[PDB]
Write an enzyme that holds these catalytic residues in place. Sequence first.
Site, PDB file in Angstrom:
ATOM      1  N   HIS A  45      37.963  50.074  60.024  1.00 18.58           N
ATOM      2  CA  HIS A  45      38.173  50.397  61.451  1.00 18.58           C
ATOM      3  C   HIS A  45      38.630  48.970  62.350  1.00 18.58           C
ATOM      4  CE1 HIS A  45      33.985  49.178  62.361  1.00 18.58           C
ATOM      5  NE2 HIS A  45      34.324  48.777  63.527  1.00 18.58           N
ATOM      6  N   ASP A  93      34.691  52.790  55.022  1.00 20.01           N
ATOM      7  CA  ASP A  93      34.827  51.593  55.947  1.00 20.01           C
ATOM      8  C   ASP A  93      34.796  50.224  55.401  1.00 20.01           C
ATOM      9  OD1 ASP A  93      35.588  50.835  58.732  1.00 20.01           O
ATOM     10  OD2 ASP A  93      33.552  51.132  59.516  1.00 20.01           O
ATOM     11  N   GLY A 186      32.072  43.459  67.933  1.00 20.66           N
ATOM     12  CA  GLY A 186      32.469  42.267  67.399  1.00 20.66           C
ATOM     13  C   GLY A 186      31.807  41.768  66.233  1.00 20.66           C
ATOM     14  N   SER A 188      31.254  44.003  63.490  1.00 18.94           N
ATOM     15  CA  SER A 188      31.680  44.893  62.479  1.00 18.94           C
ATOM     16  C   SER A 188      32.572  44.087  61.534  1.00 18.94           C
ATOM     17  CB  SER A 188      32.806  46.078  63.184  1.00 18.94           C
ATOM     18  OG  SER A 188      32.102  46.741  64.351  1.00 18.94           O
ATOM     19  N   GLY A 189      32.546  44.679  60.190  1.00 17.09           N
ATOM     20  CA  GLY A 189      33.423  43.949  59.233  1.00 17.09           C
ATOM     21  C   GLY A 189      32.478  42.952  58.540  1.00 17.09           C
TER      22      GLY A 189
END
Length: 240
Positions: A45, A93, A186, A188-189
């Site tokens: 995302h 994701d 901020g 995420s990932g």
Amino acid sequence: VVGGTEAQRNSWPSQISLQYRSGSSWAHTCGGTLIRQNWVMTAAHCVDRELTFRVVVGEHNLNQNNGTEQYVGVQKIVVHPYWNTDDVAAGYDIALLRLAQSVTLNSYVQLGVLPRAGTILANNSPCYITGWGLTRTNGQLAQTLQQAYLPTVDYAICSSSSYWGSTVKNSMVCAGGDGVRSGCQGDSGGPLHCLVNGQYAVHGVTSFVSRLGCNVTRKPTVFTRVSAYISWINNVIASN
Ligand SMILES: [Ca+2]
């Protein structure tokens, strides 16, 4: 990260910052984990929007020069086949960024160690989330990298009704929910680093939080479970 403390500059060397070009400036959007000198693992995302992205490794303070950074462009973005934006509760994701050039590995740029395939952690296992995301629900990004101890909540307790219910799947790792610490936008990932056999391993890819907020009792941060993706990951790296 809501509820953490500044990481030491040499602490989490596989952590990268994923930024996009905004005008002629560059802005932090997400985290990632360096897994090859030319491949970064991040959330799908994160690279949904059609932006120009760049990766910063060996980064520590976002706004100051640390004298340790390496900046490299992203030449190919490979998202999971099954990822669907209108449903993050669906899973998948995760995405892979091959870097336009290989980074130089040194005391600040090191590769993330991934878990073996199928590996599930015992409940309340010690894990740290790291990142430059929000420090308050609806607050603003952190300038220095933050870290917070977030112990796992296993899939049984996490898919039960007091925690996340049916919103969470077994392709995901839950950590935290004490309502004091958590991941936040901020982040995420980015990595969830879990201690396992004297080594820290990247077990989670930060994916989401509650709409109510980031830190909320019994709404742990939901990560994509890396041990479910080892074969997909490896099939992508051996192609490009
Ligand atoms: Ca810097």
